[PDB]
Nucleic acid binder design. Sequence first.
RNA 1: AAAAGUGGUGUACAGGUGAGUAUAAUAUUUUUUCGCUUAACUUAAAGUGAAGGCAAAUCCUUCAUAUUGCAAAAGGAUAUC
Lengths: 98, 53, 48, 36
Amino acid sequence: VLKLRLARFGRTNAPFYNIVVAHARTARNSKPLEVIGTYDPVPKKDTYDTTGKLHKDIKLDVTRAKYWIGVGAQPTDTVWRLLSLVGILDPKYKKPQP
Amino acid sequence: WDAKDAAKAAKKERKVLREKMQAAEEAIELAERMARHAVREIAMREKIISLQK
Amino acid sequence: GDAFQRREKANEDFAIRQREKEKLLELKKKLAEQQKHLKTLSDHIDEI
Amino acid sequence: AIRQREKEKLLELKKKLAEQQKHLKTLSDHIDEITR
RNA sequence: AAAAGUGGUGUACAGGUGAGUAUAAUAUUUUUUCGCUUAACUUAAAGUGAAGGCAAAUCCUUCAUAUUGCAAAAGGAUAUC
Ligand SMILES: [K+]
Ligand SMILES: [K+]
Ligand SMILES: [Mg+2]
Ligand SMILES: [Mg+2]
Ligand SMILES: [Mg+2]
């Protein structure tokens, strides 16, 4: 089963992720089939922006990710939430309004 | 090269015949079983129908 | 005339005659298919 | 040598295939007879 | 309602070690041409009937039906009136 998931890298208290295409039953950090992108969870801040707004840097090869979702790849919950923001899949969870 | 094509083509003709004949002689046996089983069933089914006039 | 007479006249002779004939119709169907299959093989042999 | 043996063999199958189709027909119409 | 089980899937992944092992091999790269795939993933179609054994079953055994003729299946659950 191919999966679009994250490979935890970095150092202690400095997480960094690789968006990868790997078989489900393999080691988390083993060499995958492809590296589709990267994901940094800690939000950053523009250098000369004093407004206080934060952002998150995410590099993603949308063209390569769409092909794997088209052939039957199963993204994890975290990668699903990311792919839903860019506008590829529908969200799995939503804030209840009532 | 023509000898290989001619020799190979003839090999296929020998197979289609051996396959058709094998399948033919098989349907005959399967057809005879339908006969022995039909004459018995027909003889047994027409008897009942003959007692309901 | 009455319910008992009309109900007694009716019997399984019709139902029996129907079931038996129906089984023979499907039997002839199996023979028709087998007879047909033999024709599809007869025309192929003399063809080749 | 071998052709004469295979040609006649085909006639046998063509003959048997004709007989079987005749029996299955002799029974088909027979079923129709009692079906009337 | 609990406690043991029966069955399904998973324990073929992850994790650990370097004892043994002395090699050219049906090894491997490029181009051309291909084949196989009965579990899981993705899309779709069709079919999901009948008995017996164990306390019972989606367990085991077996049958009908499934282009021709060989060849399959298993049931469980929730609403509406
Ligand atoms: K292992
Ligand atoms: K060693
Ligand atoms: Mg009677
Ligand atoms: Mg080592
Ligand atoms: Mg059923």
